[PDB]
Specification:
Blueprint lengths: L1 E4 L2 E4 L3
The protein binds one RNA strand through strand 1 and strand 2.
Length: about 15
RNA sequence: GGCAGAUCUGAGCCUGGGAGCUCUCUGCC
């Protein structure tokens, strides 16, 4: 999974 | 208990600014 944090672009494995 | 999805947004933190830490919501078994 992919996720963004108003600045920091993150992700969780798939 | 396990699995899946989610952040100019569901929120905060760390600097390296990610594929890290914590919380929350929804769905399924």
């Amino acid at each position: 999974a992919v996720r963004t944090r108003k600045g920091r672009r993150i992700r969780i494995x798939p």
